[PDB]
Symmetry: C3
Subunit: 296 residues, 3 copies
C-alpha cells in the first residue's frame, strides 16, 4: 500500500479505566507498526496499539465496555469485534475511517478467554496482517480450582503469512506459527507473536507450582493442539467457562478463535517446552519455554 | 464422465411417511444436477434428490427407517450411509446400480445431528461431488433448554473442489467453503451449498430471541470453527446429544462429519454474520447472515 | 543419511517387568528399520523397537516408570517423551547418543491414552520419520462402563511424508495417512502404520458385542475425525480420563497427539470400516476394517 511505505507508528499503551461498578472505558488504536516476527524478518503489521497480537484486555463478568477505536492508519478503515460481547455487528462492529475515532458500547455477559479482532472486509486480510488479540472476562464466582493456582500467564497462538498476500492468506500454508505472552500483573512479560522471544526469555515458575495459562488460538486459519511438555493438564475449562470442565488432558484442541483455561503442575526443575503438537507449526515457530527453578 | 455430459436431472422432493409409531419410510434419489456454487460457476453435482447438501431428514429417537434409494445416475452406482443408524455396512450401505432401486432398514437409536453421505468407493469422490447431507434424530425427552428457544434453523457446512478431480480432492485446498440451510418448518428457506444465497437472503429473527441452530460440518476434508458474530453460545450439545452439554462457548469446533445443537441470544437489531473463524474458508464463501429485526 | 544406507535393523521386543507394586522397568531401542507403508513402498523408518508406531506400553495409574532407551542408530541421537508422565524435559527427555543407553525415571500419575515420541531436535523430523507410539495408563478405579465391554483393541493414526524431507514435513500434504493396531492380549494383532494390513486382516468381533477402542492420533501434523461406520459411540472418554465423559457421539475429534477411549455396539454381521471422516486422509490410507461374525 503506497501510503504505508515507510510507516512505522510507535506502539501506544492501551487505555482502560473503570467508570462504574459494572462499566469500563477502553481506548485502542489501529496502527501500522513494524514487528520482527522471525530473526531478520520484519512484517509491517496492521495492529491494535502497535502490538500483534494486540494488548490484553481484562474485564469482569457483567461489565459493559465503552470502547473507542482511534484509527491511525492513513488509508485503510478498521473496526473491532470482541467475541466476549453481545452486540449488533452491523451497528457496533462498524468501520472507523482513517484519522477518525468511533465509540461503541456493549456488555461482556459471559466469563472466559475470548478472541478479539478487526472486522473490516476482507476480514481475513485484517486478521492475517495482525489485527487480533484476547479479552479475558473474569468469572463472578471464579473457577473451582482457583485456590490451587500458584502462578498464571496468558499465551496466544497466531500465524504469519507472506506479507499482505491475499492469495497466500487463502490458499497457502503459514510461513510462521508463533506464541506470544500478554501481561496480567506487573513484571509479567508482554511480547508479540514471533518465533524466538519466549525461547530466549522463557516464562518463569518455581518447582512444585500449579500454573494456570489463559490461552487462545487466534488463527487466522489453523487449529491448535496445545500441549505442555513434561506435564498433564490437571484441569481445563473450555473457552474459560467454569462449567466446561475437563480433567487430565494431555493436549487441548483449540478451534480457530478458541480459548481455554488450562492448569498443570511442574514437578521438577528444568525447562518445559510449550507447543502445538501439530509439529509442522512447532517447527515453524510455535514453541515457547517455561523455565522452572527452585526459586521461581 | 461421457454419460453425464449434458445431464441435468431436475430436483425430486424427498418422500417420507410414518408407517408405525416407531417406523418411518424414506425415499431418496441419487441424481446428477447442475448447481450454481458461486456466481457464474456451475458444478454438475452428484446428489441426493438434486440438492447438495441433500434434503433434510428428521426422525424421532427410536424410529426404524425403511430407506429406499432410487439411482437415476445413468452410469455410476450410489449408496447411503446414515451416521444416525446402527447397521451392517457391508449389507445395508451397499451399492444401488444405475436405474435400479434398493431398500434397507435400520434403527435410529441415538438423538442428534448426524451426517449422511454416499458410501460408494471411492467415497471421497462421491462426497466431494455433493453426496452429503444431514439427518436429525429428535430426543425422546427433548433438550433441557427447549422451553427457552424461540426460533430454530438448520445450517450445513461443506467444501467444493475442482470438478470431479480426485487429485484435487486428495491433495488440494478447497476452492469454496459454503453454508446452506435446510427447512424444518413451512416457510423456512431450503438452499444448496453456495457462496451467496444466505448473504443475499439472510436467515430471519427477532430482537431478543434465543435461536437454536442444528449444525453439521460434512467436509469432506476440513474441520469447522463455528461462530456467530455478536453473540456467545449460551448452550451447546455436541453431536446433538443432550448429555454433551457445554455453556458459554464462543466457537464450536466440529470435526469432519461433526454436528452440534447450538443456542444463542440476539440482543439488538442488525445483521449478524455466521462464519467459520478459519478465515481462509470464510473468505472462500463460508459466511451466512442472520437479519434480526424488531418484528422478525 | 550415508550411515543409514543399507541399514535395516531387525525389530527387537519391548522389555517390561514390574519391580514393585508401583514401579515398572521398561526397555526400548531406537533403531532404523524398513517398513512397507503402502504396497511396493518401503520407508526406512526411524523407530522405537523396529515398529512405527512403536510398541504399546501399558502401565497402571500411579506407576513410576524406570525407562531405558538403547540407541542403535549409528549416527543420530534419539530421546523419549512420554505424554503420560510428569518430568523435567531438559533432564529426563534428553538425548541418548548412538550406541549408548540412557535411563530416566518418572511417574504416570494420570489415567488415559497418551502419545509418546522422540524428543530430539528437530522433533518434527524424528516424529515424521516414525518415532511415535502410545502408552496406556489404566485407571485405578476403571471406567464406569467397564462391565459392558466385551472386547477391546488399540488403534493408532499417523501420517507418512516424502522420505526424510523436512520441506515436505513442514509444508506438504501427507502422502499416506494410516491406522495400526497394537496388541493388548495374546492373539491380538500387532501391526505398523500402513495402508493395507487392517483392510486385508480386519480386526475381529462378534455380533452384538460392545467394543472398546483405545485410540490416539499421533500426527505429526493432522487432526483426526474418528468414526466407526455403521455404529455410534455409546460412550467416549477424552484422553482416556474417566471424568471426560461424552455419550452418543458419531465422530470423535482428536488433536495431534490426542487420545480417547471409545465404546460402541456392533449389531449385525458384516464388515465395518473404521475411518477418519477427513476423507482425503481416508483415501490416502486411513481406513481399517472390523469384521463382525456370528462367532467372533
Ligand atoms: Cu452490582
Ligand atoms: Cu462511558
Ligand atoms: Cu483492520
Ligand atoms: Cu498448517
Ligand atoms: Cu501449589
Ligand atoms: Cu508431544
Ligand atoms: Cu412406543
Ligand atoms: Cu416398511
Ligand atoms: Cu454416490
Ligand atoms: Cu482449508
Ligand atoms: Cu425468548
Ligand atoms: Cu471472530
Ligand atoms: Cu500401594
Ligand atoms: Cu528401577
Ligand atoms: Cu529420534
Ligand atoms: Cu491433510
Ligand atoms: Cu455385550
Ligand atoms: Cu461417514
Amino acid at each position: 500500500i503506497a501510503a504505508h511505505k515507510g510507516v512505522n507508528q510507535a506502539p501506544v499503551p492501551l487505555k482502560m479505566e473503570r467508570v462504574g461498578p459494572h462499566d469500563v472505558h477502553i481506548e485502542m488504536t489501529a496502527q501500522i507498526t513494524d514487528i520482527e516476527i522471525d530473526k531478520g524478518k520484519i512484517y509491517k503489521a496492521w495492529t491494535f496499539n502497535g502490538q500483534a497480537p494486540g494488548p490484553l484486555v481484562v474485564v469482569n463478568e457483567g461489565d459493559t465496555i465503552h470502547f473507542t477505536l482511534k484509527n491511525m492508519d492513513p488509508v485503510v478503515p478498521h473496526s473491532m469485534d470482541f467475541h466476549a460481547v453481545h452486540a449488533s455487528p452491523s451497528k457496533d462492529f462498524i468501520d472507523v475511517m482513517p484519522n477518525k475515532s468511533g465509540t461503541f458500547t456493549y456488555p461482556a455477559n459471559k466469563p472466559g478467554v475470548f478472541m478479539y479482532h478487526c472486522g473490516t472486509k476482507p476480514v481475513l486480510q485484517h486478521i492475517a496482517n495482525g489485527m487480533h488479540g484476547v479479552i479475558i472476562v473474569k468469572p463472578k464466582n471464579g473457577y473451582p480450582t482457583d485456590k490451587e493456582v500458584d502462578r498464571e500467564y496468558v499465551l496466544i497462538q497466531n500465524e504469519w503469512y507472506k506479507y499482505n498476500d491475499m492469495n497466500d492468506f487463502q490458499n497457502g500454508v503459514p510461513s510462521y506459527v508463533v506464541f506470544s505472552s500478554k501481561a496480567l500483573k506487573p513484571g509479567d512479560p508482554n511480547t508479540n507473536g514471533d518465533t524466538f522471544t519466549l525461547k530466549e526469555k522463557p516464562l518463569l515458575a518455581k518447582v512444585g507450582e500449579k500454573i494456570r495459562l489463559y490461552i487462545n488460538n487466534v488463527g487466522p486459519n489453523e487449529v491448535s493442539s496445545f500441549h505442555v511438555v513434561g506435564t498433564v493438564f490437571d484441569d481445563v475449562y473450555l473457552d474459560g467457562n467454569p462449567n466446561n470442565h475437563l480433567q487430565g488432558m494431555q493436549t487441548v484442541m483449540l478451534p480457530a478463535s478458541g480459548g481455554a483455561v488450562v492448569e498443570f503442575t511442574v514437578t521438577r526443575p528444568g525447562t518445559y517446552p510449550i507447543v502445538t503438537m501439530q509439529f509442522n507449526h512447532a517447527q515453524k515457530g510455535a514453541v515457547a519455554m517455561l523455565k522452572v527453578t527452585e526459586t521461581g
